Amino acid sequence: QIQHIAIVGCVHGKYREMYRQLSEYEKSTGKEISFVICTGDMQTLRYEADLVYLKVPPKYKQMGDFHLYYEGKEKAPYLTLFIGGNHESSNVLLHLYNGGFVCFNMYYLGVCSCININGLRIVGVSGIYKSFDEKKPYTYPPSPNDVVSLFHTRNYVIQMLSNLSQSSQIDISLSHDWPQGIVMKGNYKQLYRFQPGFKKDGASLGSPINKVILNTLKPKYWISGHMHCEYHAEEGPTHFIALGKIGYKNAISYLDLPLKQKTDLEYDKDWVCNLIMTWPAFSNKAQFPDLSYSISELLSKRTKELDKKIIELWEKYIGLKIIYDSDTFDIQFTSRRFYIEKIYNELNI
Ligand SMILES: [Mn+2]
């Protein structure tokens, strides 16, 4: 038995088109899409005012299609999981830094996280890398002055995700920019023919953050967007696949994976445990994380007995299933942190 997963590069606000293309795959092949994964540049602008938070050159200050799905005039035909890239309504993604549905059937994985679906564990790392911002906290609520920095990947995601392959393997990991160095691990001479511009960065092309995460977790697949080309490479046991941008043939591909269990989208238990145990570092809603705390120090305190109690409490207050919530994003921000704090303080530490 088999599940067909659509993997999509840069959407850049062309949702109707993307879903059209996915429908046409189901038509021309007769195959069923279980769900969709998108590697970023989602541009989930709810309304005109959100344009302030979209860092793009002037010619690309446009609403795109998302607002149609947000309003409910259009309806996403398939469960679509995504991370953020460098072209985003960054204010929206900050409210949902702990993940969340932006509208029916579209689930943002957050700054980073791991989820479960159909027996797979999927890790997402949002953003692109800039050294000058990798140690910068997030300030909340979002300010228009942060349009240039909100989408830069912070280094702390490394310590948040590093222990995730301890109890089982990671099936799929998603990023926006490529893991640094992985360009050398495929047919780069051919890549450089189609993409002359890439040659000058050499092995340093990509994110050192994503490189470390890939090396640490060694997922079956690592999928990236950002670069506007298709590319495949192998870094030991990890299959790397880069996808292009919607509108071009190399934007969408399909993973044909074994399917043992069909099961709804769920929170990952190891992620949840990390989320609760790192709470002290995230306790100041105005500025997080506070790195006077050591993330790995906080996570060194995980135990089997505490993990068990955390999951019991998470199931109680939130549920294991990730379900659609239509509250405004600022409410979802406050609500998820409320329960994270509650669970943490119930553990007694
Ligand atoms: Mn991009």
Residue numbers in the entry: 5 to 353
Text of the article:
Hydrolysis of this linkage is rate-limiting in lariat degradation after splicing, and is required for efficient maturation of many small nucleolar RNAs (snoRNA) and micro RNAs (mirtrons) that are derived from intronic RNA. Dbr1 is tuned to hydrolyze 2′,5′-phosphodiester RNA linkages in branched RNA and not the considerably more abundant canonical 3′,5′-phosphodiester linkages, although the molecular basis for this selectivity has remained elusive for several decades despite extensive biochemical characterization of the enzyme.
To address this gap in knowledge, the 3D structure of the Dbr1 enzyme from the unicellular protist Entamoeba histolytica was determined using single crystal X-ray diffraction. The five protomers in the asymmetric unit are virtually identical, superimposing with an average root mean square deviation (RMSD) of 0.16 Å for backbone atoms. The observed packing interactions in the crystal are limited, consistent with analytical ultracentrifugation sedimentation velocity data indicating the protein exists as a ∼42 kDa monomer in solution. The N-terminal 261 residues adopt the MPE fold, characterized by adjacent α and β metal-binding pockets. The Mn2+ ion in the β pocket is coordinated in an octahedral geometry by the side chains of Asp45, Asn90, His180, His230, a water molecule and a sulfate ion coming from the crystallization liquor. As predicted in previous studies on the yeast enzyme, a conserved histidine residue (His91) is poised to protonate the leaving group 2′O during hydrolysis of the 2′,5′-phosphodiester linkage in lariat RNA. The electrostatic environment surrounding the active site is compatible with the binding of negatively charged RNA.
